[PDB]
Design a protein around this ligand. Sequence first.
Ligand SMILES: NC(=O)C1=CN([C@@H]2O[C@H](COP(=O)(O)OP(=O)(O)OC[C@H]3O[C@@H](n4cnc5c(N)ncnc54)[C@H](OP(=O)(O)O)[C@@H]3O)[C@@H](O)[C@H]2O)C=CC1
Ligand SMILES: CCc1nc(N)nc(N)c1C#CCc1cc(OC)ccc1OC
Length: 166
Amino acid sequence: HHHHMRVSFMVAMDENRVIGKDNNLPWRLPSELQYVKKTTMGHPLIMGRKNYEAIGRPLPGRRNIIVTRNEGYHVEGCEVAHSVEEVFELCKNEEEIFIFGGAQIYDLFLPYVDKLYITKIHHAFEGDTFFPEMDMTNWKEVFVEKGLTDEKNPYTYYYHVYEKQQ
Ligand SMILES: NC(=O)C1=CN([C@@H]2O[C@H](COP(=O)(O)OP(=O)(O)OC[C@H]3O[C@@H](n4cnc5c(N)ncnc54)[C@H](OP(=O)(O)O)[C@@H]3O)[C@@H](O)[C@H]2O)C=CC1
Ligand SMILES: CCc1nc(N)nc(N)c1C#CCc1cc(OC)ccc1OC
């Protein structure tokens, strides 16, 4: 029944798991976006249809895969899938794919996540979209580092990476 690729989550959330507000990001952290680009470069990005449209354009140097239940949905420079299994088919030969949100898409792929790249922002934003709860039993933190806080990046935040022990 198994897929061969590593399923990694890529997400940034606040102290209460908020990841979005009014179909956008509640914060603006250029430095954190650089870490995201650095980490995901050359790997497929899997994104919910809403997430993708908020971004608005294909992210260069990565396979953009959009998840939608719309069978007539198309976008140039991007791939479209309509299910977890169709993603696994498209990415069958990939080493590692990144589930890039948003919340519905995180929920979809949660039974399959092997590795978690999560930025935690030490602030409580007003929001309406939340990262799903996770049982970390049998996971281990393998990297942690404080983010750069300066004029362009006005919050305290940390990068964490957790690996499943399965
Ligand atoms: N801080 C962070 O790291 C991140 C924050 N965000 C934020 O999250 C928000 C977006 O999240 P959310 O509203 O949940 O939207 P999603 O990105 O999860 O997209 C939801 C869409 O995905 C498609 N979809 C959902 N379930 C399925 C399924 N089972 N099969 C096929 N397609 C499916 C549907 O598309 P369709 O309607 O076309 O059928 C649905 O409308 C935005 O605010 C964004 O800015 C997003 C990513 C990361
Ligand atoms: C907040 C940026 C971010 N960080 C982490 N660690 N994981 C994520 N999935 C995201 C995200 C996002 C959405 C987004 C991305 C983007 O360029 C990559 C541009 C705009 C975006 O939302 C409008």
